Amino acid sequence: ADDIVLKAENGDVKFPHKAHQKAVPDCKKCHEKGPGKIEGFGKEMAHGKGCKGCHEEMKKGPTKCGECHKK
Ligand code: HEC
Ligand code: HEC
Ligand code: HEC
Ligand SMILES: C[C@H](CCC(=O)O)[C@H]1CC[C@H]2[C@@H]3CC[C@@H]4C[C@H](O)CC[C@]4(C)[C@H]3C[C@H](O)[C@]12C
């Protein structure tokens, strides 16, 4: 399947799966969550543990605006 882009007004956000599968061997960080995670995602989650927050905790991955968002 293909990567997805989140259409943030300020600039597209690419989500590259290959890098994540390799770097986050604990698949259950994202997969087999109970219901509600598709409806639940948004800016708050993205800027918290949904994206940026995991990058901070794991000490790797983009944490600056322009590293995630790119027109
Ligand atoms: C969140 C940061 C994730 C982690 C960590 C892992 N996966 Fe993932 N997976 C995630 C998303 C948002 C998607 C769909 C969008 C996309 O870019 O693909 C997926 C998709 C998969 C798939 C389908 C892939 C394909 O057919 O190309 C598989 C088989 C899958 N995910 C498995 C998987 C495993 C085994 C992981 C740990 C090693 C893993 N994923 C990490 C989100 C996230
Ligand atoms: C942990 C549970 C993560 C979540 C949730 C998200 N990301 Fe992530 N990401 C994570 C790690 C440990 C890394 C480092 C991978 C590496 O090999 O450097 C990343 C990396 C990225 C990248 C850069 C990939 C690259 O090839 O350099 C991007 C663009 C990225 N992450 C974006 C991203 C987004 C948009 C997420 C939410 C939708 C997200 N990540 C979640 C760990 C985790
Ligand atoms: C990845 C790790 C990100 C970093 C670092 C920053 N942003 Fe972000 N942001 C990210 C995603 C995946 C999303 C989309 C949420 C969704 O609904 O799917 C966003 C969202 C925004 C928004 C709202 C966009 C909209 O509603 O259309 C804004 C205004 C925004 N982001 C700005 C922004 C700034 C200024 C940042 C640095 C301080 C920043 N983001 C970091 C992913 C990530
Ligand atoms: C559930 C995990 C981990 C974050 C958490 O613990 O909540 C998060 C990490 C990235 C999130 C995905 C990002 C791309 C998509 C954003 C959509 O708007 C909702 C569905 C998707 C596919 C999201 C589903 C889910 O919200 C995920 C996989």
Side-chain angles (χ1 to χ4, degrees):
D2 297 305
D3 287 339
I4 66 186
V5 168
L6 298 317
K7 294 297 286 176
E9 280 283 304
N10 56 309
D12 283 355
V13 177
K14 296 177 176 178
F15 176 73
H17 186 263
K18 189 178 182 162
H20 286 87
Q21 192 169 163
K22 174 177 274 213
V24 187
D26 183 14
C27 309
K28 285 190 73 170
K29 284 299 210 161
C30 295
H31 292 304
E32 301 190 284
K33 299 288 183 189
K37 291 303 180 164
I38 300 178
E39 293 172 81
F41 194 83
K43 182 187 170 285
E44 200 178 2
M45 283 297 316
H47 289 177
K49 66 172 190 175
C51 308
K52 180 192 175 170
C54 177
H55 296 168
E56 295 172 322
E57 291 173 86
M58 293 190 77
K59 312 278 197 45
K60 204 173 191 177
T63 58
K64 312 302 186 36
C65 316
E67 297 181 325
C68 286
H69 293 283
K70 184 176 160 305
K71 281 166 147 204

Coordinates of all heavy atoms in Angstrom, one line a residue:
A1 N 0.9 -1.2 0.0 CA 0.0 0.0 0.0 C 0.9 1.3 0.0 O 2.1 1.2 0.3 CB -0.9 0.0 1.2
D2 N 0.3 2.4 -0.3 CA 1.0 3.6 -0.4 C 1.1 4.4 0.9 O 0.2 4.3 1.8 CB 0.3 4.5 -1.4 CG 0.3 3.9 -2.8 OD1 1.4 3.6 -3.3 OD2 -0.8 3.7 -3.4
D3 N 2.1 5.3 1.0 CA 2.2 6.3 2.1 C 1.0 7.2 1.9 O 0.4 7.4 0.9 CB 3.5 7.0 2.0 CG 4.7 6.2 2.5 OD1 4.4 5.1 3.2 OD2 5.8 6.4 2.2
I4 N 0.7 7.9 3.0 CA -0.3 8.9 3.0 C 0.3 10.3 3.3 O 1.3 10.4 3.9 CB -1.5 8.5 3.8 CG1 -1.2 8.5 5.3 CG2 -2.0 7.2 3.3 CD1 -2.4 8.0 6.1
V5 N -0.4 11.3 2.8 CA -0.1 12.7 3.1 C -1.3 13.3 3.9 O -2.4 13.1 3.4 CB 0.1 13.5 1.8 CG1 0.2 15.0 2.1 CG2 1.4 13.1 1.1
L6 N -1.0 14.0 5.0 CA -2.1 14.6 5.7 C -2.1 16.1 5.2 O -1.1 16.8 5.2 CB -1.8 14.6 7.2 CG -1.7 13.3 8.0 CD1 -2.8 12.4 7.5 CD2 -0.3 12.7 7.8
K7 N -3.3 16.5 4.8 CA -3.5 17.8 4.1 C -3.6 19.0 5.0 O -4.6 19.7 5.0 CB -4.6 17.8 3.1 CG -4.5 16.8 2.0 CD -3.3 17.2 1.0 CE -3.6 18.4 0.2 NZ -2.4 18.9 -0.6
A8 N -2.6 19.2 5.8 CA -2.5 20.3 6.7 C -2.5 21.6 5.9 O -1.8 21.8 5.0 CB -1.3 20.2 7.7
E9 N -3.4 22.6 6.3 CA -3.4 23.9 5.6 C -2.0 24.6 5.4 O -1.7 25.1 4.3 CB -4.2 25.0 6.4 CG -5.8 24.9 6.3 CD -6.3 25.5 5.1 OE1 -6.0 26.7 4.7 OE2 -7.1 24.8 4.4
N10 N -1.2 24.5 6.4 CA 0.1 25.2 6.4 C 1.1 24.5 5.6 O 2.2 25.0 5.3 CB 0.6 25.4 7.9 CG 0.7 24.1 8.7 OD1 -0.3 23.4 8.7 ND2 1.8 23.8 9.3
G11 N 0.9 23.2 5.2 CA 1.8 22.5 4.4 C 1.5 21.0 4.5 O 1.4 20.5 5.6
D12 N 1.5 20.2 3.4 CA 1.4 18.8 3.4 C 2.3 18.1 4.4 O 3.5 18.5 4.5 CB 1.7 18.2 2.0 CG 0.6 18.4 1.0 OD1 -0.5 18.9 1.3 OD2 0.8 18.1 -0.2
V13 N 1.8 17.1 5.1 CA 2.7 16.3 6.0 C 2.7 14.8 5.5 O 1.8 14.1 5.5 CB 2.1 16.3 7.4 CG1 3.0 15.3 8.3 CG2 2.1 17.7 8.0
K14 N 3.9 14.5 5.0 CA 4.2 13.1 4.5 C 4.3 12.2 5.7 O 4.9 12.5 6.7 CB 5.4 13.0 3.7 CG 5.4 13.8 2.4 CD 6.7 13.7 1.6 CE 6.7 14.4 0.2 NZ 8.0 14.4 -0.5
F15 N 3.8 11.0 5.6 CA 4.0 9.9 6.6 C 4.6 8.7 5.9 O 3.9 8.0 5.2 CB 2.7 9.5 7.2 CG 2.8 8.3 8.2 CD1 3.5 8.6 9.4 CD2 2.5 7.1 7.8 CE1 3.7 7.5 10.3 CE2 2.7 6.0 8.7 CZ 3.3 6.2 9.9
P16 N 5.9 8.5 6.0 CA 6.6 7.4 5.3 C 6.6 6.2 6.2 O 7.2 6.1 7.2 CB 8.0 8.0 5.1 CG 8.2 9.0 6.3 CD 6.8 9.4 6.7
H17 N 5.8 5.1 5.7 CA 5.6 4.0 6.6 C 6.9 3.2 6.7 O 7.2 2.7 7.8 CB 4.5 3.1 6.1 CG 4.2 2.0 7.1 ND1 4.8 0.7 6.9 CD2 3.5 1.9 8.2 CE1 4.3 -0.1 7.9 NE2 3.6 0.7 8.7
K18 N 7.7 3.0 5.7 CA 8.9 2.2 5.7 C 9.8 2.5 6.9 O 10.3 1.7 7.6 CB 9.6 2.2 4.4 CG 10.7 1.1 4.3 CD 11.4 1.1 2.9 CE 12.5 0.0 2.8 NZ 12.9 -0.3 1.4
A19 N 10.1 3.8 7.0 CA 10.9 4.3 8.1 C 10.4 4.0 9.4 O 11.2 3.7 10.4 CB 11.2 5.8 8.0
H20 N 9.1 4.0 9.6 CA 8.4 3.8 10.9 C 8.4 2.3 11.2 O 8.7 2.0 12.4 CB 7.0 4.3 10.9 CG 7.0 5.8 11.0 ND1 7.1 6.7 9.9 CD2 7.1 6.6 12.1 CE1 7.1 7.9 10.3 NE2 7.1 7.9 11.6
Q21 N 8.2 1.4 10.3 CA 8.2 0.0 10.5 C 9.6 -0.5 11.0 O 9.7 -1.3 11.9 CB 7.9 -0.8 9.2 CG 7.7 -2.3 9.4 CD 7.1 -2.9 8.2 OE1 7.1 -4.2 8.1 NE2 6.5 -2.2 7.3
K22 N 10.6 0.2 10.4 CA 12.0 -0.1 10.8 C 12.4 0.4 12.1 O 13.1 -0.3 12.9 CB 13.0 0.4 9.7 CG 14.4 0.3 10.0 CD 15.4 0.8 8.9 CE 15.6 -0.3 7.9 NZ 17.0 -0.2 7.3
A23 N 12.0 1.7 12.4 CA 12.5 2.4 13.6 C 11.6 2.1 14.8 O 12.1 2.4 15.9 CB 12.6 3.9 13.3
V24 N 10.4 1.7 14.6 CA 9.5 1.5 15.7 C 9.0 0.0 15.7 O 7.9 -0.3 15.3 CB 8.2 2.4 15.6 CG1 7.3 2.3 16.9 CG2 8.7 3.9 15.5
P25 N 9.9 -0.9 16.0 CA 9.6 -2.4 16.1 C 8.4 -2.8 17.0 O 7.8 -3.8 16.8 CB 10.9 -3.0 16.6 CG 11.7 -1.9 17.2 CD 11.3 -0.7 16.4
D26 N 8.1 -1.9 18.0 CA 6.9 -2.0 18.8 C 5.7 -1.5 18.0 O 5.2 -0.4 18.1 CB 7.1 -1.3 20.1 CG 5.9 -1.5 21.0 OD1 5.0 -2.4 20.8 OD2 5.7 -0.7 22.0
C27 N 5.2 -2.4 17.1 CA 4.1 -2.1 16.2 C 2.9 -1.7 16.9 O 2.1 -0.9 16.4 CB 3.8 -3.3 15.3 SG 5.2 -4.1 14.5
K28 N 2.7 -2.2 18.1 CA 1.5 -1.8 18.9 C 1.5 -0.4 19.3 O 0.5 0.1 19.9 CB 1.3 -2.8 20.1 CG 0.9 -4.2 19.7 CD 0.5 -5.0 20.9 CE -0.8 -4.5 21.5 NZ -1.3 -5.4 22.6
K29 N 2.5 0.4 19.1 CA 2.5 1.8 19.3 C 1.4 2.5 18.4 O 0.8 3.4 18.8 CB 3.8 2.5 19.0 CG 4.8 2.2 20.2 CD 4.3 2.8 21.4 CE 5.4 3.3 22.4 NZ 4.8 4.3 23.3
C30 N 1.2 1.9 17.2 CA 0.2 2.4 16.3 C -0.9 1.4 15.9 O -2.0 1.9 15.6 CB 0.9 2.8 15.1 SG 2.0 4.2 15.4
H31 N -0.6 0.2 15.9 CA -1.5 -0.9 15.4 C -2.2 -1.6 16.5 O -1.8 -1.7 17.7 CB -0.7 -1.8 14.4 CG -0.3 -1.2 13.2 ND1 -1.2 -0.5 12.3 CD2 0.9 -1.0 12.6 CE1 -0.5 0.0 11.3 NE2 0.8 -0.3 11.4
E32 N -3.3 -2.3 16.2 CA -4.3 -2.9 17.1 C -4.8 -2.1 18.2 O -5.0 -2.6 19.3 CB -3.6 -4.1 17.7 CG -3.1 -5.2 16.8 CD -2.7 -6.4 17.5 OE1 -1.6 -6.4 18.1 OE2 -3.5 -7.4 17.5
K33 N -4.9 -0.8 18.0 CA -5.5 0.1 19.0 C -7.0 -0.2 18.9 O -7.5 -0.8 17.9 CB -5.2 1.5 18.7 CG -3.7 1.8 18.8 CD -3.2 1.8 20.2 CE -1.8 2.2 20.2 NZ -1.2 2.0 21.6
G34 N -7.7 0.0 20.0 CA -9.1 -0.2 20.1 C -9.7 0.9 19.1 O -9.0 1.7 18.6
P35 N -11.0 0.8 19.0 CA -11.7 1.7 18.0 C -11.6 3.2 18.4 O -11.4 3.5 19.6 CB -13.1 1.2 18.0 CG -13.3 0.7 19.3 CD -12.0 0.0 19.7
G36 N -11.6 4.1 17.4 CA -11.7 5.5 17.7 C -10.4 6.2 17.2 O -10.4 7.4 17.3
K37 N -9.4 5.5 16.8 CA -8.1 6.1 16.5 C -8.1 6.8 15.1 O -7.4 7.8 14.9 CB -6.9 5.1 16.5 CG -6.6 4.7 17.9 CD -6.2 5.8 18.9 CE -5.8 5.2 20.3 NZ -5.1 6.3 21.0
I38 N -9.0 6.4 14.2 CA -9.2 7.0 12.9 C -10.0 8.4 13.1 O -9.6 9.4 12.5 CB -9.9 6.1 11.9 CG1 -9.0 4.8 11.7 CG2 -10.1 6.8 10.5 CD1 -9.6 3.8 10.9
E39 N -11.0 8.3 13.8 CA -11.8 9.5 14.1 C -11.0 10.4 15.0 O -11.2 11.7 14.9 CB -13.1 9.1 14.8 CG -14.0 8.3 13.9 CD -15.2 7.7 14.7 OE1 -16.2 8.5 14.9 OE2 -15.2 6.5 15.1
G40 N -10.2 9.9 15.9 CA -9.5 10.7 16.9 C -8.4 11.5 16.5 O -8.1 12.6 17.1
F41 N -7.7 11.1 15.4 CA -6.5 11.9 15.0 C -6.8 13.3 14.6 O -7.9 13.6 14.0 CB -5.7 11.1 13.9 CG -4.4 11.7 13.7 CD1 -3.3 11.3 14.5 CD2 -4.1 12.6 12.7 CE1 -2.0 11.8 14.3 CE2 -2.8 13.1 12.5 CZ -1.8 12.7 13.3
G42 N -5.9 14.2 14.9 CA -6.0 15.6 14.4 C -4.8 16.4 14.9 O -3.8 15.8 15.2
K43 N -4.9 17.7 14.9 CA -3.7 18.5 15.2 C -3.2 18.2 16.6 O -2.0 18.1 16.8 CB -4.1 20.0 15.1 CG -3.0 21.0 15.3 CD -3.6 22.4 15.4 CE -2.6 23.4 15.8 NZ -2.3 23.4 17.3
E44 N -4.1 18.2 17.6 CA -3.6 18.0 19.0 C -2.9 16.7 19.1 O -1.8 16.6 19.7 CB -4.9 17.9 19.9 CG -4.6 18.1 21.4 CD -5.8 18.1 22.2 OE1 -6.9 17.9 21.7 OE2 -5.7 18.3 23.5
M45 N -3.4 15.6 18.5 CA -2.7 14.3 18.6 C -1.4 14.4 17.8 O -0.3 13.9 18.3 CB -3.5 13.2 18.0 CG -4.6 12.7 19.0 SD -3.9 11.9 20.5 CE -2.6 11.0 19.9
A46 N -1.4 15.0 16.6 CA -0.2 15.1 15.8 C 1.0 15.9 16.5 O 2.1 15.5 16.3 CB -0.6 15.8 14.5
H47 N 0.6 16.9 17.2 CA 1.6 17.7 17.8 C 2.0 17.1 19.2 O 3.0 17.6 19.8 CB 1.1 19.2 17.9 CG 1.1 19.9 16.6 ND1 0.7 21.2 16.5 CD2 1.6 19.5 15.4 CE1 0.8 21.6 15.2 NE2 1.4 20.6 14.5
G48 N 1.2 16.2 19.7 CA 1.5 15.4 20.8 C 1.9 13.9 20.5 O 2.7 13.8 19.5
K49 N 1.4 12.9 21.1 CA 2.0 11.6 21.0 C 1.7 10.9 19.7 O 2.3 10.0 19.3 CB 1.5 10.7 22.2 CG 0.1 10.3 22.2 CD -0.2 9.3 23.2 CE -1.6 8.8 23.1 NZ -1.8 7.6 24.1
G50 N 0.8 11.5 18.9 CA 0.5 11.0 17.5 C 1.6 11.1 16.5 O 1.8 10.3 15.6
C51 N 2.5 12.1 16.7 CA 3.6 12.3 15.8 C 4.8 12.9 16.6 O 5.7 12.2 16.9 CB 3.3 13.2 14.6 SG 1.9 12.8 13.6
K52 N 4.7 14.2 16.8 CA 5.8 15.0 17.3 C 6.3 14.4 18.7 O 7.5 14.3 19.0 CB 5.4 16.4 17.4 CG 6.6 17.4 18.0 CD 6.0 18.7 18.3 CE 7.0 19.7 18.9 NZ 6.4 21.1 19.0
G53 N 5.3 14.1 19.5 CA 5.6 13.6 20.9 C 6.4 12.3 20.9 O 7.3 12.0 21.7
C54 N 6.1 11.4 19.9 CA 6.8 10.1 19.9 C 8.3 10.4 19.4 O 9.2 9.9 19.9 CB 6.2 9.1 18.9 SG 7.3 7.7 18.8
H55 N 8.4 11.4 18.5 CA 9.7 11.7 18.0 C 10.6 12.3 19.2 O 11.8 12.0 19.3 CB 9.6 12.8 16.9 CG 9.0 12.3 15.6 ND1 8.6 13.1 14.6 CD2 8.6 11.0 15.3 CE1 8.0 12.3 13.7 NE2 8.1 11.1 14.0
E56 N 10.0 13.0 20.0 CA 10.7 13.6 21.2 C 11.0 12.5 22.2 O 12.2 12.5 22.7 CB 9.8 14.6 21.9 CG 9.6 15.9 21.0 CD 8.6 16.9 21.6 OE1 7.6 16.5 22.2 OE2 8.9 18.1 21.4
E57 N 10.1 11.6 22.5 CA 10.3 10.5 23.4 C 11.4 9.5 23.0 O 12.3 9.1 23.8 CB 9.1 9.7 23.7 CG 8.0 10.5 24.5 CD 6.6 9.8 24.6 OE1 6.5 8.9 25.5 OE2 5.7 10.0 23.7
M58 N 11.4 9.2 21.7 CA 12.3 8.2 21.1 C 13.6 8.8 20.7 O 14.5 8.1 20.3 CB 11.7 7.5 19.9 CG 10.5 6.6 20.3 SD 9.9 5.6 18.9 CE 11.2 4.3 18.9
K59 N 13.8 10.2 20.8 CA 15.0 10.9 20.4 C 15.4 10.8 19.0 O 16.5 11.0 18.6 CB 16.1 10.5 21.3 CG 15.8 10.4 22.8 CD 15.9 11.8 23.5 CE 16.0 11.7 25.0 NZ 16.9 10.7 25.4
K60 N 14.4 10.6 18.1 CA 14.6 10.6 16.7 C 13.3 10.9 15.9 O 12.2 10.5 16.3 CB 15.1 9.2 16.3 CG 15.9 9.2 15.0 CD 16.5 7.8 14.8 CE 17.6 7.8 13.6 NZ 18.2 6.4 13.5
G61 N 13.4 11.5 14.8 CA 12.3 12.0 13.9 C 12.1 13.5 14.0 O 12.5 14.1 15.0
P62 N 11.4 14.0 13.0 CA 11.3 15.5 12.9 C 10.5 16.1 14.1 O 9.4 15.6 14.4 CB 10.5 15.7 11.6 CG 9.8 14.4 11.4 CD 10.8 13.4 11.9
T63 N 11.0 17.2 14.7 CA 10.3 18.0 15.7 C 10.1 19.5 15.4 O 9.5 20.2 16.2 CB 11.1 17.9 17.1 OG1 12.4 18.4 16.9 CG2 11.2 16.4 17.5
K64 N 10.6 19.9 14.2 CA 10.4 21.3 13.8 C 9.3 21.4 12.8 O 9.1 20.5 11.9 CB 11.7 21.9 13.2 CG 12.9 21.6 14.1 CD 12.8 22.2 15.5 CE 14.1 22.1 16.3 NZ 15.3 22.3 15.4
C65 N 8.6 22.6 12.8 CA 7.5 22.8 11.9 C 7.8 22.4 10.4 O 7.0 21.6 9.8 CB 7.1 24.3 11.9 SG 7.0 25.1 13.5
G66 N 8.8 22.9 9.9 CA 9.2 22.8 8.5 C 9.8 21.4 8.1 O 10.1 21.1 7.0
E67 N 10.1 20.6 9.2 CA 10.5 19.2 8.9 C 9.4 18.3 8.6 O 9.6 17.2 8.0 CB 11.3 18.7 10.1 CG 12.6 19.5 10.3 CD 13.4 19.1 11.5 OE1 12.9 18.6 12.5 OE2 14.7 19.2 11.4
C68 N 8.2 18.6 9.1 CA 7.0 17.8 8.9 C 6.1 18.4 7.8 O 5.7 17.7 6.9 CB 6.2 17.7 10.2 SG 6.9 16.6 11.4
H69 N 5.9 19.7 7.9 CA 5.1 20.5 7.0 C 5.9 21.0 5.8 O 6.9 21.7 6.0 CB 4.5 21.7 7.7 CG 3.5 21.3 8.8 ND1 2.2 20.9 8.5 CD2 3.6 21.3 10.1 CE1 1.6 20.7 9.6 NE2 2.4 20.9 10.6
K70 N 5.5 20.7 4.6 CA 6.1 21.2 3.4 C 5.1 21.3 2.3 O 4.5 20.4 1.8 CB 7.2 20.2 2.9 CG 8.1 20.6 1.7 CD 9.2 19.6 1.3 CE 9.7 19.8 -0.1 NZ 8.7 19.7 -1.1
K71 N 5.0 22.6 1.8 CA 4.1 22.8 0.7 C 4.5 22.2 -0.7 O 3.6 21.7 -1.4 CB 3.9 24.3 0.5 CG 2.9 24.9 1.5 CD 3.0 26.4 1.5 CE 1.6 27.1 1.7 NZ 1.6 28.5 1.2
Ligands
HEC1 C1 2.8 4.5 13.5 C2 3.8 5.4 13.7 C3 3.0 3.2 12.9 C4 4.0 2.3 13.3 C5 5.0 2.5 14.5 C6 3.9 1.1 12.4 N1 2.8 1.3 11.5 FE1 2.2 0.1 10.1 N2 1.0 1.6 9.4 C7 0.8 2.8 9.9 C8 0.0 3.6 9.1 C9 -0.6 5.0 9.3 C10 -0.3 2.7 7.9 C11 -1.2 3.1 6.6 C12 -0.5 4.3 5.8 C13 0.8 3.9 5.2 O1 1.6 4.8 5.0 O2 0.9 2.7 4.8 C14 0.3 1.5 8.1 C15 0.3 0.4 7.3 C16 0.8 -0.8 7.6 C17 0.8 -2.0 6.8 C18 0.2 -1.9 5.3 C19 1.5 -1.6 4.5 C20 1.5 -1.9 3.0 O3 0.7 -2.8 2.5 O4 2.3 -1.2 2.3 C21 1.3 -3.0 7.4 C22 1.5 -4.4 6.8 C23 1.8 -2.5 8.7 N3 1.5 -1.1 8.8 C24 2.4 -3.2 9.6 C25 3.3 -2.7 10.6 C26 4.2 -3.4 11.4 C27 4.5 -5.0 11.4 C28 4.9 -2.5 12.2 C29 6.0 -2.7 13.2 C30 7.1 -3.2 12.9 C31 4.3 -1.2 11.9 N4 3.4 -1.4 10.9 C32 4.6 0.0 12.5 C33 1.3 3.2 11.2 C34 2.3 2.6 11.8
HEC2 C1 6.5 6.4 17.4 C2 5.4 5.8 18.0 C3 6.2 7.4 16.2 C4 5.1 7.9 15.8 C5 3.7 7.8 16.5 C6 5.4 8.7 14.7 N1 6.7 8.6 14.4 FE1 7.6 9.5 12.8 N2 9.4 8.6 13.4 C7 9.6 7.8 14.5 C8 11.0 7.5 14.6 C9 11.7 6.7 15.7 C10 11.6 8.1 13.4 C11 13.1 8.0 13.0 C12 13.2 7.1 11.7 C13 14.5 7.2 11.1 O1 15.0 6.2 10.6 O2 15.2 8.3 11.1 C14 10.6 8.7 12.7 C15 10.7 9.4 11.5 C16 9.8 10.2 10.8 C17 10.1 10.9 9.6 C18 11.4 10.9 8.8 C19 11.7 9.6 8.1 C20 13.0 9.6 7.4 O3 13.1 8.8 6.5 O4 13.9 10.3 7.9 C21 9.0 11.6 9.3 C22 8.7 12.5 8.0 C23 8.0 11.3 10.3 N3 8.5 10.4 11.2 C24 6.7 11.7 10.4 C25 5.7 11.3 11.3 C26 4.4 11.7 11.2 C27 3.8 12.7 10.2 C28 3.7 11.0 12.2 C29 2.2 11.1 12.6 C30 1.3 11.0 11.6 C31 4.7 10.2 12.9 N4 5.9 10.4 12.3 C32 4.5 9.4 13.9 C33 8.6 7.5 15.4 C34 7.3 7.8 15.3
HEC3 C1 5.4 16.3 12.9 C2 6.1 15.6 13.8 C3 4.9 17.7 13.1 C4 5.5 18.8 13.6 C5 7.0 18.8 14.2 C6 4.6 19.9 13.5 N1 3.5 19.6 12.9 FE1 1.9 20.7 12.6 N2 0.8 19.1 12.1 C7 1.3 17.8 11.9 C8 0.3 17.0 11.3 C9 0.4 15.5 10.9 C10 -0.9 17.8 11.3 C11 -2.3 17.3 10.7 C12 -3.3 17.0 11.7 C13 -4.5 16.3 11.0 O1 -5.6 16.8 11.1 O2 -4.3 15.3 10.3 C14 -0.5 19.1 11.7 C15 -1.4 20.2 11.8 C16 -1.0 21.5 11.9 C17 -1.9 22.6 11.8 C18 -3.4 22.6 11.5 C19 -3.5 22.3 10.0 C20 -5.0 22.2 9.5 O3 -5.9 22.1 10.4 O4 -5.2 22.1 8.3 C21 -1.1 23.7 11.9 C22 -1.6 25.2 11.8 C23 0.3 23.3 12.1 N3 0.3 21.9 12.2 C24 1.4 24.1 12.3 C25 2.6 23.7 12.8 C26 3.6 24.5 13.4 C27 3.6 26.1 13.4 C28 4.6 23.7 13.9 C29 5.9 24.1 14.6 C30 5.7 24.8 15.7 C31 4.2 22.3 13.6 N4 2.9 22.4 13.0 C32 4.9 21.2 14.0 C33 2.6 17.4 12.1 C34 3.6 18.2 12.7
LIG4 C1 -2.9 5.5 16.9 C2 -1.6 5.9 16.4 C3 -0.6 6.3 17.6 C4 -1.1 7.6 18.3 C5 -2.0 7.2 19.5 O1 -1.5 6.5 20.4 O2 -3.1 7.7 19.6 C6 -1.7 7.1 15.4 C7 -0.3 7.4 14.8 C8 -0.6 8.0 13.4 C9 -2.1 7.9 13.2 C10 -2.5 7.8 11.7 C11 -2.0 9.0 10.9 C12 -2.6 9.0 9.4 C13 -4.1 9.0 9.5 C14 -4.7 10.3 10.0 C15 -6.2 10.3 9.9 O3 -6.7 11.6 10.4 C16 -6.7 9.2 10.8 C17 -6.2 7.8 10.4 C18 -4.7 7.8 10.3 C19 -4.3 6.5 9.6 C20 -4.1 7.8 11.7 C21 -4.6 6.6 12.7 C22 -4.0 6.7 14.1 O4 -4.5 7.8 14.7 C23 -2.5 6.7 14.0 C24 -1.9 5.4 13.4

